[PDB]
Amino acid sequence: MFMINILSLIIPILLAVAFLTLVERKVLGYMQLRKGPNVVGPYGLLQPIADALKLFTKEPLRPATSSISMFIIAPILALSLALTMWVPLPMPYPLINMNLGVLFMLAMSSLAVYSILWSGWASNSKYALIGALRAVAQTISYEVTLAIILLSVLLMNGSYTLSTLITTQEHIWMIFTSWPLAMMWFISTLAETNRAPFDLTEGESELVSGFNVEYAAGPFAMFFMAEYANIIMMNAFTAILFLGASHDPHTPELYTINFVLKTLALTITFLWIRASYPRFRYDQLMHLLWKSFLPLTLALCMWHISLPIMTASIPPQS
Amino acid sequence: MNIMLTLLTNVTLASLLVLIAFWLPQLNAYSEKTSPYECGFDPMGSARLPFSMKFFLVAITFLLFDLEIALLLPLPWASQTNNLKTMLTMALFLLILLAASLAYEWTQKGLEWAE
Amino acid sequence: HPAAHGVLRLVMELSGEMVRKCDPHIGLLHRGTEKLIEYKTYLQALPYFDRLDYVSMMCNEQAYSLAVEKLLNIQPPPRAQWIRVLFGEITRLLNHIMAVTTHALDIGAMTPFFWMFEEREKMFEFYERVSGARMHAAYIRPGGVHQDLPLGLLDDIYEFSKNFSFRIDELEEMLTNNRIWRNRTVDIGVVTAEDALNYGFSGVMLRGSGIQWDL
Amino acid sequence: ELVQVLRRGLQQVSGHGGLRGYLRVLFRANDVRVGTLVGEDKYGNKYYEDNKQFFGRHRWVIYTTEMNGRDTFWDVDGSMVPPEWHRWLHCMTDDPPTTKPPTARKYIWTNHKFNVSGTPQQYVPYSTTRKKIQEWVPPSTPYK
Amino acid sequence: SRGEYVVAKLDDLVNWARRSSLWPMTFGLACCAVEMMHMAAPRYDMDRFGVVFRASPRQSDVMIVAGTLTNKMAPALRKVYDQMPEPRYVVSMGSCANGGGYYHYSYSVVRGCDRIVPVDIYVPGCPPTAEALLYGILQLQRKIKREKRLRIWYRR
Amino acid sequence: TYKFVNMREPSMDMKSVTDRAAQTLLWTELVRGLGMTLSYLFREPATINYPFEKGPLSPRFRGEHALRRYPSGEERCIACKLCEAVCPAQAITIEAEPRADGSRRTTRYDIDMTKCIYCGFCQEACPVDAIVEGPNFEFSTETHEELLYNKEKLLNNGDKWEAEIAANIQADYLYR
Amino acid sequence: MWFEILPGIAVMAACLFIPGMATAHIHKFTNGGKEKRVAHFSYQWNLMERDRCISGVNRYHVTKGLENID
Amino acid sequence: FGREDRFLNYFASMRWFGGVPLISLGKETVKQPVYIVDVSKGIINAIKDPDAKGKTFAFVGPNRYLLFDLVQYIFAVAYRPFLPYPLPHFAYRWVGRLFEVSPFEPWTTRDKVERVHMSDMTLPHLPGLEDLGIQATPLELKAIEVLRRHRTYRWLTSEMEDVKPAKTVN
Ligand SMILES: COC1=C(OC)C(=O)C(C/C=C(\C)CC/C=C(/C)CC/C=C(\C)CC/C=C(\C)CC/C=C(/C)CC/C=C(\C)CC/C=C(\C)CC/C=C(\C)CC/C=C(/C)CCC=C(C)C)=C(C)C1=O
Numbered sequence A: 001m002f003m004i005n006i007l008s009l010i011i012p013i014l015l016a017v018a019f020l021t022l023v024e025r026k027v028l029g030y031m032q033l034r035k036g037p038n039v040v041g042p043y044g045l046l047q048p049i050a051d052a053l054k055l056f057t058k059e060p061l062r063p064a065t066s067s068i069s070m071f072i073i074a075p076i077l078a079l080s081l082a083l084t085m086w087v088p089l090p091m092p093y094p095l096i097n098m099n100l101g102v103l104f105m106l107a108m109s110s111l112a113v114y115s116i117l118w119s120g121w122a123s124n125s126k127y128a129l130i131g132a133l134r135a136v137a138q139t140i141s142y143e144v145t146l147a148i149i150l151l152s153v154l155l156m157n158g159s160y161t162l163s164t165l166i167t168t169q170e171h172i173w174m175i176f177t178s179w180p181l182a183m184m185w186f187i188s189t190l191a192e193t194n195r196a197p198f199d200l201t202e203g204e205s206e207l208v209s210g211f212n213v214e215y216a217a218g219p220f221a222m223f224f225m226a227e228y229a230n231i232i233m234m235n236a237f238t239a240i241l242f243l244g245a246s247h248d249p250h251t252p253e254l255y256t257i258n259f260v261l262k263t264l265a266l267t268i269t270f271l272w273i274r275a276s277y278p279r280f281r282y283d284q285l286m287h288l289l290w291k292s293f294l295p296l297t298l299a300l301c302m303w304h305i306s307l308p309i310m311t312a313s314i315p316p317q318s
Numbered sequence B: 001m002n003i004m005l006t007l008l009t010n011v012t013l014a015s016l017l018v019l020i021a022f023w024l025p026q027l028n029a030y031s032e033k034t035s036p037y038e039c040g041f042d043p044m045g046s047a048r049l050p051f052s053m054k055f056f057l058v059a060i061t062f063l064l065f066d067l068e069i070a071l072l073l074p075l076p077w078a079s080q081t082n083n084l085k086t087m088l089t090m091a092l093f094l095l096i097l098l099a100a101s102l103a104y105e106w107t108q109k110g111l112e113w114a115e
Numbered sequence C: 001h002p003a004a005h006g007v008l009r010l011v012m013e014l015s016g017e018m019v020r021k022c023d024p025h026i027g028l029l030h031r032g033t034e035k036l037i038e039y040k041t042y043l044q045a046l047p048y049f050d051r052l053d054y055v056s057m058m059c060n061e062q063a064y065s066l067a068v069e070k071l072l073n074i075q076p077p078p079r080a081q082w083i084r085v086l087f088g089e090i091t092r093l094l095n096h097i098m099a100v101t102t103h104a105l106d107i108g109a110m111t112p113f114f115w116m117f118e119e120r121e122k123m124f125e126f127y128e129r130v131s132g133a134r135m136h137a138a139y140i141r142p143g144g145v146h147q148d149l150p151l152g153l154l155d156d157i158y159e160f161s162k163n164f165s166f167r168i169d170e171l172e173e174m175l176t177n178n179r180i181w182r183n184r185t186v187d188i189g190v191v192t193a194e195d196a197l198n199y200g201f202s203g204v205m206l207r208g209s210g211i212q213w214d215l
Numbered sequence D: 001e002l003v004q005v006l007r008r009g010l011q012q013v014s015g016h017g018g019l020r021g022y023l024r025v026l027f028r029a030n031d032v033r034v035g036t037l038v039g040e041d042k043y044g045n046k047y048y049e050d051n052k053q054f055f056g057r058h059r060w061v062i063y064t065t066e067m068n069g070r071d072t073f074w075d076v077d078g079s080m081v082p083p084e085w086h087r088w089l090h091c092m093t094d095d096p097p098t099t100k101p102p103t104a105r106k107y108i109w110t111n112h113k114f115n116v117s118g119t120p121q122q123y124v125p126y127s128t129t130r131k132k133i134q135e136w137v138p139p140s141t142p143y144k
Numbered sequence E: 001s002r003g004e005y006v007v008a009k010l011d012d013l014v015n016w017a018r019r020s021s022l023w024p025m026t027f028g029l030a031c032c033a034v035e036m037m038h039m040a041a042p043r044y045d046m047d048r049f050g051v052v053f054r055a056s057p058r059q060s061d062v063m064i065v066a067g068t069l070t071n072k073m074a075p076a077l078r079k080v081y082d083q084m085p086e087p088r089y090v091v092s093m094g095s096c097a098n099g100g101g102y103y104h105y106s107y108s109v110v111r112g113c114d115r116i117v118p119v120d121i122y123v124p125g126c127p128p129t130a131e132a133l134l135y136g137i138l139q140l141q142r143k144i145k146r147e148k149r150l151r152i153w154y155r156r
Numbered sequence F: 001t002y003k004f005v006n007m008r009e010p011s012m013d014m015k016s017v018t019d020r021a022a023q024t025l026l027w028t029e030l031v032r033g034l035g036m037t038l039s040y041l042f043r044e045p046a047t048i049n050y051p052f053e054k055g056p057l058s059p060r061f062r063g064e065h066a067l068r069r070y071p072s073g074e075e076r077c078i079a080c081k082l083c084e085a086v087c088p089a090q091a092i093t094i095e096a097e098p099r100a101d102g103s104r105r106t107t108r109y110d111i112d113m114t115k116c117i118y119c120g121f122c123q124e125a126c127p128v129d130a131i132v133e134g135p136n137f138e139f140s141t142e143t144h145e146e147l148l149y150n151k152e153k154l155l156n157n158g159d160k161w162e163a164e165i166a167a168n169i170q171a172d173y174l175y176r
Numbered sequence G: 001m002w003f004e005i006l007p008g009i010a011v012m013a014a015c016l017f018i019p020g021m022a023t024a025h026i027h028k029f030t031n032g033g034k035e036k037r038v039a040h041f042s043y044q045w046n047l048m049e050r051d052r053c054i055s056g057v058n059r060y061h062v063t064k065g066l067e068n069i070d
Numbered sequence H: 001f002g003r004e005d006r007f008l009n010y011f012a013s014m015r016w017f018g019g020v021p022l023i024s025l026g027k028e029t030v031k032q033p034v035y036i037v038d039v040s041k042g043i044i045n046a047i048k049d050p051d052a053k054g055k056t057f058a059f060v061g062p063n064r065y066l067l068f069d070l071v072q073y074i075f076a077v078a079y080r081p082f083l084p085y086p087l088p089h090f091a092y093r094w095v096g097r098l099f100e101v102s103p104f105e106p107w108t109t110r111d112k113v114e115r116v117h118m119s120d121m122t123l124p125h126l127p128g129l130e131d132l133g134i135q136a137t138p139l140e141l142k143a144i145e146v147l148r149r150h151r152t153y154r155w156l157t158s159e160m161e162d163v164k165p166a167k168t169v170n
């Protein structure tokens, strides 16, 4: 039955990734006064299927100068970690109920960083190398900021368990409690997922597709799937962490509906931001977190250490 | 057990997708098809040559600050102790030292990229 | 390359990502227009100017027509001159829309591109109604213009002009005070007035540097 | 309120003749609008107008399911319109062929032909001029 | 036959995705490239048809040779076409790309991009309207529909 | 006259300083951009449903070429080669000879549509309105040779589009 | 109009419903119609093991009570 | 032999199957491959030659190699390790039988193994490229055109002269 549960977690996530591709296309079109895909099927519903079939029936090539061993591993690692990030999320019952349900997320994200690095380096191309180093810098910045922000927010919670996050947010919302950390965390999630205005590793205007310049057909589709799965997963993480839904043990479907609605709202906000804003410059992104977010993040961490102690509201350990 | 099973499942699915991608479609590869891409012209040098890293100092500071976050992570359990005064004093000591390190680097221009 | 306008080879020497020297290689779109003009007549050479700067078509045509009329010692009629000025300003709007929107697209903003290109489509409709060609009109000729305006063109141009200030305001609501756009564009490519004059810059470059010069 | 718009959608479902016609128009034209029928030509193409729509979408055409000898249920071309309806659709005039028929000439084709490229009916170029130089023809009677 | 039926349905399935998922390379020359931009503009939105521009030739299916091809540019165009993986299609747009255009008798112009790359569709004009190029794209899609690769393989 | 685009200076009073600080901390202009994008989302798109809806055109439109006839059926062209002389791209080739009835009629009239720039000088220079640039523009071909028209192809185009061409010429001939 | 974006969003939402609902149903199915026992600590794990031992069927979710003591 | 050929590609694609199986270690087979451009030029010249109407031409290369030497040179130019081993003829035939069950283009067949093992005939009486006016291009000049694709990034840029010519049998 556990294998059935794993499949039920995996396959709908990939379906949601494909239809998120479609939704982003249409949302950007209507924000840009276009229509978006509406020809392939009824309201363009078959467009993701057409694109997937085309990509997996098209020829993939390996560059002559490429290191083939790490050329193949990078999409495998990216997709595997994108799917693995979904196992501890409670909706409202996690597939795997990890006691430290957040450090696993941090470690797997840091490991998923290396997929783009190894794809860029293995490609043996200058644009891929530039994209890889942009990934290095972006990872530095968002890693330190994410670590401190998450520490503070979970310090308001009591432990590193997401079901405990639900129980904490039973009455009110962490967005109400700690909205500055929430805004900085949203920016950090944008940077982590490489979405605009921080799409530096794959900046089309400055680089020709960045790290995946040499990737075509199936391997490229795996990078796209991993990116969109990470987008949805991080939006779900933000929704669980800051927008806590009410949970009824006897009818847990209501929590699932609320969680999915919040996740969709955050993902549509991601697409909205991409449509609205220009692109950063990676040195300006590094100076944005270190020189603006990091000082305020340290101050807010001190404040959120002191607040439960000074108000006699330290959360229960269990 | 379950975590190993799901890791195996994800890796197997990704590997199967790679196998399908590299064996289903028709392949016709020649020398120019697989050549490196440099916007239509041949590359002047090699991509394996040294590539200057203008933020080398910031990477080392990132290493040290990663240590700092490693130290700061067990705070949620440290708030359950009876010695709340000592715990708060030492936590604020660590955070103040981290802030002082950031301030020193910023004022000595360690955060400015090399020209 | 998306930012290289398709036909520019820019050989760059980078230390990391800092630029050490730029060596633009041009001529990938060299056609021998001047030689072909030498081989064509005066009327047969107008489309060559029509295709030189394909975002200011009637402006190129007006420049060529002014040169030919100056050599011929003739004078266009006042209605022809007014049509030339009106369509020159329409073409200036077209070119500025293209320039600003492609700049914002290279920087990472595309919705202004789409909006202003709908506006460009309307101005292309004006071009096509007056000439029969949507962009390469070949309408302004030595001595005046080829044909007179249709009997609804002025009203349609008035409607478009009335409903365009809001489009410009919507464009400015997205970029002018945006901190990301200011970070990308402020203090980038600074050229002094003396350097601009010596290098032979003209128009927007001089006026941005602060030189009060407009032909 | 949205109730009125839902009622309009259901009317469009009923206006097209039910679920079957609505689906057929949706899956072959990607739009389910209803408008006044301006006319229909000899090839089966129908033409509708709706002045309430903005300029550009206030005139449209539903293509026939079979033209000449081609099964045109799905693969609809933009060259299938005859010249008169082409002019009306592209808005070179506000007078439809039904109201203002064009002048009839004895040489104008009775049946319109779409783009025949890729078919054995495609145009093939050739020289339309005869041979410039005539070669000498030696006698058939031997001299000896 | 069962085999012929299976290969016919499979070929229809494969041709449908390629027909409805065209990803042209971001590649434009001279004046004809502006009409591609107006095609991508809201008025004649190409994205609704499944036509999406991509920058890398590896991730591109169609090359739209839109504008004049010069002698100094021909090697680069051939290089990017070669680096574009199969299946790949070519649409030449405008008189310059079709034949010589206004610059046919020029020392530095290639009289037709088909001297360099095999061209699948020719779009005539100077420049062809955005509607004309959209018609050319739809004609290319219809050309893709008639391909029978699995049917050729089965009867081979 | 002239005007300064960026020459203003901000007031340093406490209220303005606090407003700027709030804009910096609370991303007010970013929210404004989001609001503008949302407005455009809720607006109606300008996309037309091609090919079922066609973009507007004018009687002066230059499209595919055609050779016209008099109402009697006789060809209008008199082999005067004015179009060939004025053609900027040299895309027209003409060869003529006396016909069986002595008329001045062409035997070869070729137009290279891969060389033509669609500038419309040929229909301006024609003194009999024989060669015209019709309204058709959807004539893309799968092979190069199909775009090398000859007299038969151009006469076929004229016969095919005669009604629309005649209507457009009637509508626009008073401006010529 | 803008409401043609809804069907894609509706399909994506339906796809995202499946994981959580399926996990809840599988938890209830494999735990005797009750929530899966959460054992974050050795005490709770020992409770689960004792429940397995007392049940006599090697299933912790099979609960015994007063009718079992007497 | 050429870019899209079978010969050089077939011999250079045995990398994936560990070592190189050869019948009698390739010591009993002598082959003289001919260049594709030379073949095409001869075909074109035979059309323009008026006194080649009803004839039979043999197109062979200028050098004859043992199969072992030829495969060794192919692997040396491709910069791949060469590990040959003798495989009995019946076993090689069975291997070819296994590979020909592919509905697609087979990698190798029993007939292909037979042809590879067979030595190229000598037909002095028939005319050739020198009779048609074409000088046969030696393998050592155009081998790098085909076998450079089979190299890795380590040896991609190694020059043509870097590899000694194979030992001929004349
Ligand atoms: C001159 O030059 C030019 C320029 O200057 C160079 C320019 O600037 C421009 C201007 C250009 C622009 C302005 C364009 C930029 C602006 C835009 C708005 C473009 C936006 C672009 C995008 C948004 C692209 C992003 C989208 C992409 C890349 C598409 C990717 C699509 C996908 C589908 C991703 C792949 C997903 C996959 C593979 C998911 C697969 C899923 C599975 C495997 C799961 C399987 C599940 C199952 C099997 C379960 C099945 C279950 C059931 C019930 C089915 C059973 C039924 C049966 C019948 C079997 C122009 C025009 C130009 O010309």
Ligand SMILES: CCCCCCCCCCCCCCCCCC(=O)OC[C@H](COP(=O)([O-])OCC[N+](C)(C)C)OC(=O)CCCCCCCCCCCCCCCCC
Pocket: A073, A077, A097, A098, A099, A100, A101, A104, B001, B002, B003, B004, G039, G040, G041
């Ligand atoms: C024989 C197997 C060999 C596998 C080799 C490859 C994987 C190597 C790592 C070890 C195996 C996987 C983890 C096993 C854990 C066993 C214990 C367990 O289940 O604990 C439950 C715990 C439960 O969480 P908990 O510990 O917080 O709770 C305790 C238990 N309860 C809930 C009862 C209180 O699981 C975890 O904590 C999950 C941790 C996952 C860590 C994964 C580490 C490896 C990641 C990949 C490494 C390799 C990268 C390669 C990169 C690419 C190279 C080419």
Ligand SMILES: CCCCCCCCCCCCCCCCCC(=O)OC[C@H](COP(=O)([O-])OCC[N+](C)(C)C)OC(=O)CCCCCCCCCCCCCCCCC
Pocket: A049, A052, A053, A056, A057, B020, B024, B025, B026, E006, E009, E010, E013, E014, E149, E150, E152, E153, E156, H104, H105
């Ligand atoms: C949303 C999904 C995401 C993941 C998608 C993963 C891919 C799914 C693809 C499914 C369809 C695959 C169809 C075959 C594609 C062949 C590609 C190719 O190169 O073809 C040209 C080649 C052409 O071969 P050739 O013989 O012409 O080769 C000579 C080529 N030259 C001359 C250039 C050298 O065709 C083949 O090789 C034949 C392939 C036969 C089919 C292979 C198995 C396909 C099985 C599909 C599922 C079947 C289900 C049961 C039947 C159902 C019937 C209704």
Ligand SMILES: CCCCCCCCCCCCCCCCCC(=O)OC[C@H](COP(=O)([O-])OCC[N+](C)(C)C)OC(=O)CCCCCCCCCCCCCCCCC
Pocket: B019, B020, B023, B024, B025, B026, B027, H017, H095, H098, H099, H101, H102, H104, H105
């Ligand atoms: C279930 C396990 C799968 C493992 C991987 C197998 C490959 C397929 C992976 C899944 C994707 C399938 C997609 C559709 C089908 C296409 C792929 C496929 O099936 O290719 C088959 C390949 C296809 O050859 P191909 O190179 O033409 O593949 C391209 C296929 N098309 C044309 C469709 C693009 O065919 C064979 O392998 C036939 C021969 C089988 C026997 C030999 C196998 C190799 C040699 C091994 C033995 C070597 C020693 C010999 C002596 C032994 C005794 C001592």
Ligand SMILES: CCCCCCCCCCCCCCCCC[C@@H](O)O[C@H](CO[C@H](O)CCCCCCCCCCCCCCC)COP(=O)(O)OCC[N+](C)(C)C
Pocket: A039, A040, A041, A046, A049, A053, D027, D028, D029, D030, D074, D075, D076, E009, E010, E012, E013, E016, E019
């Ligand atoms: C996981 C492995 C891969 C999964 C693949 C199977 C899952 C997807 C199933 C197929 C997706 C839908 C395919 C059918 C699309 C129908 C859409 C409809 O519009 O197409 C019509 C008919 O579709 C095609 O013409 C027929 C080919 C597509 C169907 C192939 C037959 C079924 C193949 C097997 C399907 C199940 C797969 C089983 C084996 C895996 C004609 O469209 P077209 O004329 O172009 O458009 C012209 C433009 N218009 C609309 C404005 C006029």
Ligand SMILES: CCCCCCCC/C=C/CCCCCCCC(=O)OC[C@H](COP(=O)(O)OCCN)OC(=O)CCCCCCC/C=C/CCCCCCCC
Pocket: B096, B097, B099, B100, B101, B103, B104, B107
């Ligand atoms: C506090 C740690 C250091 C302890 C003493 C070690 C001395 C020797 C080691 C030196 C390393 C310490 C470096 C950190 C301080 C040096 C930074 C510095 O020089 O400038 C400080 C910088 C200068 O800014 P500007 O001059 O305006 O910049 C102009 C740019 N154009 O301003 C600062 O002071 C920032 C420092 C912020 C954190 C400082 C940490 C100390 C604060 C202690 C407060 C808590 C005390 C606890 C009392 C509790 C009472 C109940």
Ligand SMILES: CCCCCCCC/C=C\CCCCCCCC(=O)OC[C@H](COP(=O)(O)OCCN)OC(=O)CCCCCCC/C=C/CCCCCCCC
Pocket: A294, A295, A296, A298, A299, B096, B099, B100, B102, B103, B104, B106, B107
């Ligand atoms: C409490 C109720 C009352 C509320 C009102 C109290 C508010 C006042 C409290 C003290 C205010 C502190 C003001 C000091 C900040 C101004 C310092 C300053 O301006 O430095 C200038 C200069 C400008 O930056 P540039 O690099 O030059 O920008 C590029 C220009 N081209 O800044 C610097 O050089 C950096 C200065 C060191 C940065 C320190 C940041 C790290 C410390 C913050 C972490 C959290 C606080 C730590 C604990 C605080 C308590 C000990």
Ligand SMILES: CN(C)C(=N)NC(=N)N
Pocket: C002, C005, C006, C102, E028, E030, E033, E034
């Ligand atoms: C201005 N021109 C000609 C472009 N091709 N521009 C562009 N942004 N691609």
Ligand code: SF4
Pocket: C051, C136, E029, E030, E031, E032, E066, E067, E068, E093, E094, E095, E096, E097, E101, E102, E125, E126, E127, E128, F117
């Ligand atoms: S065909 Fe005409 S519009 Fe196109 S590139 Fe050539 S001159 Fe410019």
Ligand code: SF4
Pocket: F083, F086, F087, F088, F089, F090, F091, F092, F111, F115, F116, F117, F118, F119, F120, F121, F122, F123
């Ligand atoms: S439109 Fe201009 S280029 Fe074309 S045939 Fe007529 S005169 Fe020549």
Ligand code: SF4
Pocket: F076, F077, F078, F079, F080, F081, F082, F083, F084, F094, F122, F125, F126, F127, F128, F129, F130, F131
């Ligand atoms: S200008 Fe008119 S009449 Fe004269 S040759 Fe040309 S088509 Fe004939």
